[PDB]
Each structure stands twice: as C-alpha cells, then as structure tokens.
Design an enzyme around this catalytic site. Structure first.
Site, PDB file in Angstrom:
ATOM      1  N   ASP A   1       0.875  -1.244   0.278  1.00  0.00           N
ATOM      2  CA  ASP A   1      -0.434   0.297   0.137  1.00  0.00           C
ATOM      3  C   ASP A   1       0.367   1.422   0.153  1.00  0.00           C
ATOM      4  O   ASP A   1       0.664   2.191   0.824  1.00  0.00           O
ATOM      5  CB  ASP A   1      -0.503   0.082   1.168  1.00  0.00           C
ATOM      6  CG  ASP A   1      -2.499   0.515   1.000  1.00  0.00           C
ATOM      7  OD1 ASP A   1      -2.525   1.296  -0.056  1.00  0.00           O
ATOM      8  OD2 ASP A   1      -3.301   0.980   2.259  1.00  0.00           O
TER       9      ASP A   1
ATOM     10  N   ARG B   1      -0.511   9.463   0.752  1.00  0.00           N
ATOM     11  CA  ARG B   1      -1.346   9.277   1.284  1.00  0.00           C
ATOM     12  C   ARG B   1      -0.637   8.422   3.034  1.00  0.00           C
ATOM     13  O   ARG B   1      -1.382   8.702   4.526  1.00  0.00           O
ATOM     14  CB  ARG B   1      -2.264   8.990   1.313  1.00  0.00           C
ATOM     15  CG  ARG B   1      -3.502   7.298   1.516  1.00  0.00           C
ATOM     16  CD  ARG B   1      -4.518   6.979   1.319  1.00  0.00           C
ATOM     17  NE  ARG B   1      -3.954   6.688  -0.474  1.00  0.00           N
ATOM     18  CZ  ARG B   1      -3.725   5.667  -1.424  1.00  0.00           C
ATOM     19  NH1 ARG B   1      -3.638   4.521  -0.323  1.00  0.00           N
ATOM     20  NH2 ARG B   1      -3.394   5.487  -2.867  1.00  0.00           N
ATOM     21  N   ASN B   2       0.149   7.148   2.923  1.00  0.00           N
ATOM     22  CA  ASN B   2       0.588   6.731   3.667  1.00  0.00           C
ATOM     23  C   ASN B   2       2.329   6.832   4.020  1.00  0.00           C
ATOM     24  O   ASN B   2       2.699   5.479   4.216  1.00  0.00           O
ATOM     25  CB  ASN B   2       0.872   4.845   3.132  1.00  0.00           C
ATOM     26  CG  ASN B   2      -0.886   4.970   1.887  1.00  0.00           C
ATOM     27  OD1 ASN B   2      -1.471   3.728   2.248  1.00  0.00           O
ATOM     28  ND2 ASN B   2      -2.103   4.773   3.395  1.00  0.00           N
TER      29      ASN B   2
ATOM     30  N   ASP C   1       1.741   2.869   7.754  1.00  0.00           N
ATOM     31  CA  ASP C   1       0.474   2.044   7.197  1.00  0.00           C
ATOM     32  C   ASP C   1       1.040   0.508   6.916  1.00  0.00           C
ATOM     33  O   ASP C   1       0.191   0.001   5.911  1.00  0.00           O
ATOM     34  CB  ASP C   1      -0.175   3.214   6.247  1.00  0.00           C
ATOM     35  CG  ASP C   1      -0.845   4.115   6.591  1.00  0.00           C
ATOM     36  OD1 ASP C   1      -1.321   3.741   8.354  1.00  0.00           O
ATOM     37  OD2 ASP C   1      -1.452   4.796   6.466  1.00  0.00           O
TER      38      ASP C   1
HETATM   39  C1  LIG Z   1       0.369   2.709  13.275  1.00  0.00           C
HETATM   40  C2  LIG Z   1      -0.021   4.022  13.108  1.00  0.00           C
HETATM   41  C3  LIG Z   1      -0.113   5.441  13.892  1.00  0.00           C
HETATM   42  C4  LIG Z   1      -0.219   6.577  13.150  1.00  0.00           C
HETATM   43  C5  LIG Z   1       0.319   6.606  11.999  1.00  0.00           C
HETATM   44  C6  LIG Z   1      -0.513   8.452  11.131  1.00  0.00           C
HETATM   45  N1  LIG Z   1      -1.072   8.502  10.970  1.00  0.00           N
HETATM   46  N2  LIG Z   1      -1.110   9.552  10.800  1.00  0.00           N
HETATM   47  C7  LIG Z   1      -2.453  10.629   9.731  1.00  0.00           C
HETATM   48  C8  LIG Z   1      -2.928   9.391   8.844  1.00  0.00           C
HETATM   49  C9  LIG Z   1      -3.539  11.494  10.588  1.00  0.00           C
HETATM   50  C10 LIG Z   1      -1.333  11.302   8.711  1.00  0.00           C
HETATM   51  C11 LIG Z   1       0.129  10.285  11.746  1.00  0.00           C
HETATM   52  N3  LIG Z   1      -0.054  11.148  11.525  1.00  0.00           N
HETATM   53  C12 LIG Z   1       1.273  11.834  12.060  1.00  0.00           C
HETATM   54  N4  LIG Z   1       2.096  10.884  12.969  1.00  0.00           N
HETATM   55  C13 LIG Z   1       1.475   9.416  13.177  1.00  0.00           C
HETATM   56  N5  LIG Z   1       2.121   9.260  13.230  1.00  0.00           N
HETATM   57  C14 LIG Z   1       0.581   9.296  11.804  1.00  0.00           C
HETATM   58  C15 LIG Z   1       0.073   6.009  10.924  1.00  0.00           C
HETATM   59  C16 LIG Z   1       0.375   4.731  11.649  1.00  0.00           C
END
Ligand SMILES: Cc1ccc(-c2nn(C(C)(C)C)c3ncnc(N)c23)cc1
Ligand SMILES: Cc1ccc(-c2nn(C(C)(C)C)c3ncnc(N)c23)cc1
Lengths: 283, 283
Positions: free
Chosen positions: A146, A150-151, A164
C-alpha cells in the site's frame, strides 16, 4: 477461526500502561484505523511526556479491520530503519487496542505536498529516502502493498517515514504474496499483475513506487485524473500509462515508466531506483 | 481475475443517460460507497424530474469496493418488495459507475431513531416491516449479512427499506455462504458462528436482526456499549449477551435472546419473528 486464534494468542516490552497515555485530537481516519494525537508519560526510557500518535479501531470495526490493526502491530515490532515509522508500544490489556507510534509533525506526504508550491531537489530527496526505506523492507522480505503519498509520513526535519503496515505481508518463502479475494489497496496504485492476477511482490511495490513518484512530482496530484478506477483494467492491458506531468524532467518520467513496465522483471529494483535518484540529485 | 471478468462482462433496461442525471449534496459515505442526493429526468416512465439517491465509489476505490458496488447492483436488479430499497437504474457507459435508487426522505433508521424521543407501537411496526422484508429475501435464498439500523432506510410515511446489498450472497445451492478471509461486517452485529467460523446463513441474519431489535428499542443505541470488539470472541462463547435495555418489555427482550441462541437451529425464522411482533402489536 484465524482471528479468534490471534486475539486469544495476543491476550496471552511492547505493553504500555493505559493510565500513562492521554489521547487528544483526531489526526485522521481511513481504511482500517483512526489516528489521534497523544502524549505518553515515561515512554520507554524517556523522562516526562512524549508527544506520540496513536492508532485505534474505528466505530463498528469489522474482523477485517481488527486483523489489519493486529497485523500492522506485528510488522512494526520487526522493523527499524530511519525511514520507517517507529513503534513505541501498545495498550491492549485495558480498553480498546491502541498502537503508539512516533509522531510525524508534518502529517502525510500527500497533505504536506498539497500545502506546498519546495525545489526539485527536495522532491528527489523525498523519493530517495522512501526508496531507501523500501530497499530495507524488501531486504526484510516484506511486501508493503500500500505504498502511496497518503501512507508516507513527514516527520521533523522533513524526514520521510513509510507507514501503514496493515496490508504488508511476509514473502520469505515464495517471494510473492497471493490473495484469493479482492484487495483493499486503491486500484490506481496497484501493479497490472496485482490488479488482474492478485500477485504481490517487491516488483509490484516498485510499480506503486512509480505512482508515488508521480504524486511527488505533481505535488500531491490525483493519479489517472478523471479516469474511473474500473477503466484501469483495459487502460493498463492495452499498454497505456500516465503522461509526463508538468514540471517533470524527462529522466524522472523515464524512471516512472520503467516502474510501470508490464513485465515485473523489467522494472528496476529499489537499489537501482535509489542509484537513479541520487544521480539526478547530484546532476 | 474474477473482477476484470465482471467489469468486462458488464461493459458488454437498467442503463440511464448520464445527461439526464443531476447530482447534489452528499448524503453519506462509508464502507464501500458514497451517496449523494440527486434528480433524474424522465426516469423509467415518470414524466419530469424525480428526486433519487445515487451511490458511487469513493475516491481511491479498491478492487474490493468496486466488486461490492457491482454486487449490490446485481442483487438489487433481482429484488422487489415494499420493504426493500427500489433500484431505478445505473449510469455506466459515461463516467464512474452510479447506481440510482429510490430516495428515502428520512435517511437511515439509526439517524431517524437518534433524532427521536415515537411510541412502542411505532417501534414494533418498524421491526415488523424489516422482518417482512427479511422473510422475502430469505425466500429468495439471499443472505443479507449486514443487517443493522445504519443499513435500513426510512422512506416517506416512515416505511422501512432494507438497503446496502453489497455484501449479500446467494445461498440457493447450500443454504450458507462461507468466506475464507475476514468479513467486512461490524463484529458487534455478527453471529457467533460467523465471527468464529465464517459461516453465514439466514439464521446468522436472524442474530443480526436481534441486534437491530436492540438498536430500535434503545432508539439507536450502540451495541455492547463500552466493550471493545476484540472482547466479543470470549464474551460470546462464554455465553454472555446484552442485558435487557431500559424501556424494553420482557417479551421483546425474550425475542432478542432467542435471536442470539448459540445454536443457529434454535433461533426463530423470520416468519416466526414477524408472528411474534404482530402479536406484541395487537396486545
Ligand atoms: C500505526 C500508525 C499510527 C499512526 C500513523 C499516522 N497516521 N497519520 C495520519 C494518517 C493522520 C497522517 C499520522 N500523522 C502523524 N503521525 C503519525 N504517526 C500518523 C500511522 C500508523
Ligand atoms: C444503492 C444505494 C443507494 C443509496 C442508499 C442510501 N444511503 N443512504 C444513506 C447511507 C446516506 C442514509 C441513503 N439515504 C437516503 N436514500 C437512500 N437511497 C440512501 C443505499 C444504497
């Protein structure tokens, strides 16, 4: 079934006291998880509070989402690299499952890019850091599946963190992961052979990397713009690919094309990709 | 693969001219689809504009979501009953896939209930209309799988319309549908045997009906409140069930319990359920 087994096994170094975690605003939602900003007291040797991000299940979670959250946890325990999001812990024993990770100050790469106007060299730097992370995961025998703007997270110092891991799969034994039912990866980032044949490999990750390159170069553009996902089957097998975007050198475009070769063996490997990008940087 | 085949077969009475459809505000999003309010010109014999609802794919759709939208379409073509949402058509030939259905003025049952304070007899009437729709689908050899207040629509005259057929499956041959990978149905509405063994039947629909009854009776409450989904495996197999809610007669509760019997053969069938509810109505 396979899940009840995992949940029971799990419920039997990573555990963090729920009472030492304070959750704050929602940072984002999406496919399997909800993410909130949070703070953690006395986290793994760090004195005082550390600002962290926490992923949990959304309301009305399905077995599929629970499995994905457990899987992401399982994968994040095994990985460690400067360009992969760092796991701190989880809260499991009391309340809902919560995964505690490194907070990425600038949010998603896509969001960061769309807020932008950044040089071509910053862009190449971003791609290259991601290719290094990907070279490391490929060496660990993981297929990420993935990969997308966005990831990817952007941390302090504009460091890329691949994130992710819910759909990542171990390919030690066969060098591929094959899924009988339909994937939950957006169609517009999937390799032609993942789309048609449900086959995922490091080389299908390389295809996704090509789409990510396109996203970086367009500053968070939408792939195959104005084309419905269902038209991708025919568009792809008739040999069409996205056109060179504006503000894209020909060498960069050439790399995207090579990532999208029909034959997986013809695409570069992440190590070639990194060499290509470092070369564009220095020239 | 199975999807490319469907998409290609499809692209080869239900078709509606895209130019005769005008889309308006977003009514809701969620698991596989986005729903907008719309108007359709000269729809199937109706002179002038008809107000309709339209489901389409969300941004960045996956093969799984595309499959679900095609499947919902396929199922809705075959069903016709006063308590099942009515299909008008689709736009496929130009642009993204759009499914055009009957507009339900009051939105989802859950939303309708949560906006409320409605008599016990209105509540029984709602459940009973849904049980009739379900008796009809069970006679058609369909297992619905995702029965829940959020997936029931309330149309003009407060008519219940069973909706969201993306996960419905034909069980003509075996009277069950079995899914190897994890389901996308919320765990808190799944039968114990669907949760543990991935087996879906009309009797697992009856279990979900029991949870829906609980939702109706609590006016849109959240099932197993404050209990994390992962705790359901153990809670269920150790024989626990939700307690009688406030404002619930004992006969109503007794019916919920019977829908949640461990042994599927011990739960009522939808025809028994309808008889039970009509009896509560008249008493
Ligand atoms: C296990 C896990 C935990 C958090 C994140 C994550 N998602 N996202 C978004 C999607 C809001 C940008 C984040 N934004 C800032 N810091 C992060 N760490 C994350 C991803 C995976
Ligand atoms: C195929 C299809 C199309 C639309 C709907 C639908 N969803 N929803 C929400 C979820 C917004 C309440 C609706 N609200 C009013 N009328 C409707 N018809 C719908 C369901 C299935």
């Amino acid at each position: 079934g396979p899940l009840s087994l995992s949940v029971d096994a799990f419920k039997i170094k990573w555990e963090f006291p729920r009472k030492n975690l304070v959750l704050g605003k929602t940072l984002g939602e999406g496919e399997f998880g909800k993410v909130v900003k949070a703070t953690a007291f006395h986290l793994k040797g760090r004195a005082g509070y550390t600002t962290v991000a926490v992923k949990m299940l959304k309301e009305n979670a399905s077995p599929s989402e629970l499995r994905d959250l457990l899987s992401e946890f399982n994968v994040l325990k095994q990985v460690n690299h400067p360009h992969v999001i760092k796991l701190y812990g989880a809260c499991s024993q009391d309340g809902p499952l919560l995964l505690i990770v490194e907070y990425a100050k600038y949010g998603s790469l896509r969001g960061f890019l769309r807020e932008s106007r950044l040089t071509m060299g910053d862009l190449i730097s971003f791609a290259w850091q991601i290719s290094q992370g990907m070279q490391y995961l490929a060496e660990m025998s993981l297929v990420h599946r993935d990969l997308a703007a966005r990831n990817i997270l952007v941390a302090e110092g504009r460091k890329m963190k691949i994130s992710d891991f819910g759909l990542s799969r171990d390919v030690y034994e066969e060098d591929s992961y094959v899924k009988r039912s339909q994937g939950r990866i957006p169609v517009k980032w999937m390799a032609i052979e993942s789309l048609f044949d449900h086959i995922y490999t490091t080389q299908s990750d390389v295809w996704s990397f090509g789409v990510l390159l396109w996203e970086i170069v367009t500053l968070g553009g939408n792939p195959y713009p104005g084309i419905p996902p269902e038209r991708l089957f025919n568009l792809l097998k008739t040999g069409h690919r996205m056109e060179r975007p504006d503000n894209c050198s020909e060498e960069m475009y050439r790399l995207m094309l090579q990532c999208w070769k029909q034959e997986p063996d013809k695409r570069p490997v992440f190590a070639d990709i990194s060499k290509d990008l470092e070369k564009m940087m220095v020239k």
